Design a protein around this ligand. Structure first.
Ligand SMILES: Nc1nc2c(ncn2[C@@H]2O[C@H](COP(=O)(O)OP(=O)(O)O)[C@@H](O)[C@H]2O)c(=O)[nH]1
Ligand SMILES: [Mg+2]
Length: 171
């Protein structure tokens, strides 16, 4: 059984990722049995609040973590910038050994006019997939995987990858 913790800025879609996949509050735990490469594995999902108010409690959730899903929204460059500035340092402070998968969320919004118009008011654009992939390399993430809890694009893949990385580490 594999312990997976999701971290990242508020509003990127952490809670939505886990609920979409496994099917109303700050911190919550989920448990699912998942078929990975043909055999069942128990996956514990710990959903954390990403607001600065925490690190109060948040790192208390980290004990014995096998895999971190470090999430940013692909339509939030600020959340991408926080991967380097806040999240990788925090994870590495508490669990320096644990594998990380860099997870880009809300992929469907790359094609949402309202969202794109809003980003452009500050001359921003969605995070290029190339940039995410390069960062994943820089931070020594296992991989970069981009997904949508709305359309379920790559949602299975995110958690399959989490389990594979998590078993390898655990073992
Ligand atoms: N369009 C779209 N909206 C999403 C997606 N994932 C989450 N949301 C919405 O984004 C907001 C933040 O989601 P939430 O699960 O609360 O994020 P968290 O704060 O990181 O846990 C909510 O309005 C969700 O409905 C997605 O993949 N696509
Ligand atoms: Mg949430």
């Amino acid at each position: 059984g594999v312990k997976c913790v999701l971290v990242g800025d508020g509003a990127v879609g952490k809670t939505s990722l886990v609920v979409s996949y496994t099917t109303p509050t700050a911190f919550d735990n989920f448990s699912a049995v998942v078929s990975v490469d043909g055999r069942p594995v128990r996956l514990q999902l710990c959903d954390t609040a990403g607001q600065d108010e925490f690190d109060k409690l948040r790192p208390l959730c980290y004990t014995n973590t096998d895999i971190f899903l470090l999430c940013f929204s692909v339509v939030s460059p600020s959340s991408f910038q926080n991967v380097s500035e806040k999240w990788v340092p925090e994870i590495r402070c508490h669990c320096p050994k644990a594998p990380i998968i860099l997870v880009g969320t809300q992929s469907d919004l790359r094609e949402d006019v309202k969202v794109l118009i809003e980003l452009d008011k500050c001359k921003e654009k969605p995070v290029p997939e190339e940039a995410a992939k390069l960062l994943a390399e820089e931070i020594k993430a296992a991989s970069y995987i981009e997904c949508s809890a709305l359309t379920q694009k790559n949602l299975k893949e995110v958690f399959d990858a989490a389990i594979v990385a998590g078993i390898q580490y655990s073992d």
